[PDB]
Design a protein around this ligand. Structure first.
Ligand SMILES: O=Cc1cccc(O)c1O
Ligand SMILES: O=Cc1cccc(O)c1O
Ligand SMILES: O=Cc1cccc(O)c1O
Ligand SMILES: O=Cc1cccc(O)c1O
Ligand SMILES: [Zn+2]
Ligand SMILES: [Zn+2]
Ligand SMILES: [Zn+2]
Ligand SMILES: [Zn+2]
Lengths: 321, 323, 324, 325
């Protein structure tokens, strides 16, 4: 398939490069993160990707406790991104990096990126760290409501990307560093953060919000029925502040991408749960090979009509292209 | 479908009853947990369930930090269960409750239950608490290897059931108590515990072990490909003790049940990932209605041959009920 | 689900009533007759009880396609269409109509379609397979040259054509000899309709008139499950197909066809279709009065698909297709 | 996957070679002929390169079923079976055989089946649909009374019967008039075979001989997708069906049939079949030489199913069905 849109495609600036085993692989990953116009573009040309919506790596800004420095790095990463996109505006779009450890500063930067730089959304790596940085700050908290109000006003999607939990909140993984990151920790951290947003009632207040999750929803589709329907015989209204069910917000305010989850069975389950209209192609480059993602997607077992939607038209619609 | 086997069916004793919002619902749940020969049996007769493998509620024994006490409560719960099964051996089988905060004591109690009481397996509610009870004790730790060797020797399945994480390990849920329990916390806690067992190399050392997970695998099937294949371009070997991939152990040493997850889409995904031969019917009664579980399973969109396997023969084979 | 649209919903006029007699046991004939003649009473109450807002009505089968005499065929078609228009007018907020066509006379059929669409406001046509004409011993398929002008008009008017089943003629039914239970909805209906559809595709009809919209009931008469094989059998042979059409069967099926759930309330079948043609091209339908409305609705309300797709298949796909 | 078993793999003898001429363009005819006559060379090299350990061979189509003279049919069937036995003997660790049968003569077919199984060690029979006999203008279906003794012997021998396709006779093909491209594997093969299978079911054959094992290629010739409708159409009519069989079509399909992946390398189709008949009754097959072995193997090795089912469908279901363990 040609003319695809990919939207979980990362890059890094020297300041965040360290955020992502010594050897040829680490050297190659560093090159990939810093490259935009060469290797990356050539692969897009060879693997039917017309549009790549770029985003800074992780955890990046979300792991900078000093709001002062966080604001600076975010602004820097965004200006570099804007400069890179301007080189091939017909191929590159951008997601803004935000210093959410400072609500007002984050709101201001999002406005600058969207209104002045033409960015089409924001991508944030989970909870923020601030001050001593020993407390995970989730976005369902009261201090972030004004920010969400602005996101809805600008009417641009918010990509909730993964990050690892803090050491003090990772005891279940002690002795098993191999379970951290994309293996599992990433999904749990992001899925729960997403559920917190839903349970908080954020989407009752701002129903036009569009949240995007990668890695096919971080496991949510498979367990969505249970999330709401567990212990169904108990006919008492849910305790959380949200007015409706988790499935309602997931089906109405979320979209998921195929980033780093090139599995047909998983895609079929998602198609039968959230629907093909809310699934988007993405790769997670440079952490995943573009050819791996594209070759899988080009042949996965779905209707050609849905391959066109998931690979291109869903995204073009969502981002008003 | 008639002749079904269900194996995540709970009961409680006064001592553990509390582990399980005042009103008519709480009163009903208590009655259900304490009943075995009446209401429960009537529902089994009305909803085609021939065999019910019973197990104590949660967290129960796993939440008793004092070794001696945990050993006492487990032994008591097992003796009670043994007596209840003896009244209708043609309908009730039993899973052992184990005081794993004391490895040696747990091994002996399992032997006692299997060899002297005829129990067909063990059901444990995740990690154990011991001493000050501030440290979650996972079963991939070295001190539990002798235990697993015995489980394999006795050749009976181990049902790894959920429990909530300790408060100090649940900050991600702070302010959202509704996310604890069956809504989500139960699955995360159990899925990871399962992965720890796998990564530890436990199944290389004891390949004949049979582990059972409820709630359709606690989310594992959907993300299994990613667990091993994420960042595939990096051809460097994983550094965990296990010699093979997570999918190998999941596919060869695990079985999942339909407890509290009556969703056809989820079942189809599981069938295309682990296969119908490793999926078992279960309800999670009394936390789930038996009619809800049975009505869903009787009509879910699978081959009739697989409805028979998942509903009955897979379990008959696993627990050696045909000889 | 409420507000559903159903489009394989039949009725009969006295002149075609008997065509449905040999499709149900004699003990159920009285009831089936009542159902076929009733449009404003029981039918509407069932629609209200089972969340059906719009019902696109069509004459029963084989009806007009089984009338060998052209003059007579044209007569019955016009009468059936006039009656349908009269019934729809009594409850225009709930009923729409498909035209019955005397295709044993191409020119007459083209004229009748124009009248139904332009003057009566019909939203499409429903035809029960091949036509019989003259001695009526030869099945007339619509991929034949004489029907090209007709198809050009269908595309111009831009209304869908529902290719409904009918049984093959006796001389073309030997494979079912001794097995009358295989005729009709059990199997014969599907084979007859699936092949007719393939004939249209292979003929190049859609190369000439790419904007045509054809609708098939019973989840595509079996086509989705075998579509890959239809084009890809003997793939090692790198040579172009031998038929007139310029592209593959899957291209025309994916671009010019839509399928309905009429008389095929099977979740597995729906999942396969979703993974082959996509939810955007599947429409809810019941096949009432030959199928119970509650059977169709209860199954569809709970089938294992995304709620977003339940809304599309149950309502919005049809509202988009018929420009409602 | 290595160690696969494939069971819709054809060959031909000079006497039946021309039967396959009309199913491939003139340019590919030379190649198809080579493939059909080859068993020990090219075929084996492809099996070694594409993980196929066992290939159960069968004569091409329509072959014997299109020979109306009983005597000639018996002669050709016997000759084809002797050649096949000779070929299998050259490499018995890789090749097994399905018997060709002269069913235009029930008694002769029964005797030849006995000879193939008891003396030649054949593991079943493969028949290309209905038989023609005498004037050859009437399709002879196996649900007819004269074939009951034969079926009884098939059950006694306890070997599977592969009901393979063939095209209908011209007078029974008017729906395809002007569309020769719809005959054969494109569609006609499936319709012809699906209905023949339904006739067997409806006849009550499986009530009388419940241990029979019938095999269909091309993923069931379309049956799985429409099976619900076959039994449940017009469900509101609460009256038993009119056919002689005591149960439902789905019952016989689920209990007496197995389907193969021959010439139908489509994941969506396989998923539907898994959710209808179950993985325990689906078998890998290629339809070589009409289909490329690598096409079948490459697709099957990567299709979206559980690895446990890939092993069953690719090898163990067949080994269990043909008692190879
Ligand atoms: O965004 C993906 C990603 C980020 C950091 C590390 C890693 O392994 C990843 O796959
Ligand atoms: O075992 C299931 C279970 C246990 C404790 C509480 C609960 O809600 C449950 O569903
Ligand atoms: O249109 C459907 C239909 C028509 C005639 C007969 C029958 O059984 C049917 O299901
Ligand atoms: O068996 C398959 C087959 C036989 C004859 C002809 C053909 O095209 C085929 O695909
Ligand atoms: Zn990423
Ligand atoms: Zn439980
Ligand atoms: Zn109809
Ligand atoms: Zn063949």
């Amino acid at each position: 398939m040609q003319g695809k849109v990919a939207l979980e495609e990362h890059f890094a600036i020297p300041e965040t490069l360290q955020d992502s085993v010594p050897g040829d692989y680490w050297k190659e990953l560093q090159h990939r993160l810093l490259d935009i116009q060469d290797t990356r573009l050539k692969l897009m040309d060879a693997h039917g990707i017309e549009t790549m919506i770029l985003s800074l790596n992780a955890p990046a800004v979300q792991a900078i406790p000093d709001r002062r420095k966080a604001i600076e790095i975010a602004r820097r990463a965004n200006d570099v991104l804007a400069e890179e996109c301007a080189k091939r505006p017909d191929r590159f779009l951008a997601f803004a990096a935000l210093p959410l450890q400072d609500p007002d500063a984050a709101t201001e930067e999002l406005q600058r990126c969207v209104n002045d730089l033409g960015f089409v959304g924001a991508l944030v790596n989970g909870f923020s760290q601030e001050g001593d940085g020993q407390t995970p700050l989730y976005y369902d908290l009261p201090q972030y409501r004004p920010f969400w109000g602005e996101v809805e006003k600008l009417d641009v999607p918010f990509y909730l990307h993964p990050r690892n939990p803090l050491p003090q909140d990772s005891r279940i993984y002690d002795g098993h560093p191999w379970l951290l990151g994309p293996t599992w920790a990433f999904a749990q951290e992001t899925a729960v953060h997403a559920l917190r947003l839903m349970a908080s009632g954020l989407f009752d207040e701002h129903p036009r919000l569009n949240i995007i999750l990668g890695h096919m929803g971080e496991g949510l589709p498979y367990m969505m029925w249970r999330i709401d329907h567990r212990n169904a015989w108990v006919k008492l209204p849910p305790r959380y502040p949200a007015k409706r069910r988790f499935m309602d917000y997931f089906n109405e305010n979320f979209h998921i991408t195929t980033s780093g989850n090139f599995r047909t069975q998983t895609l079929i389950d998602a198609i039968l749960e959230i629907g093909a209209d809310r699934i988007l192609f993405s790769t997670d480059w440079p952490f995943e090979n573009i050819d791996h993602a594209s070759d899988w997607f080009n042949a996965t077992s779905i209707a050609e009509a849905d391959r066109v939607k998931i690979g291109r038209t869903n995204a073009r619609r969502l981002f008003k292209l």
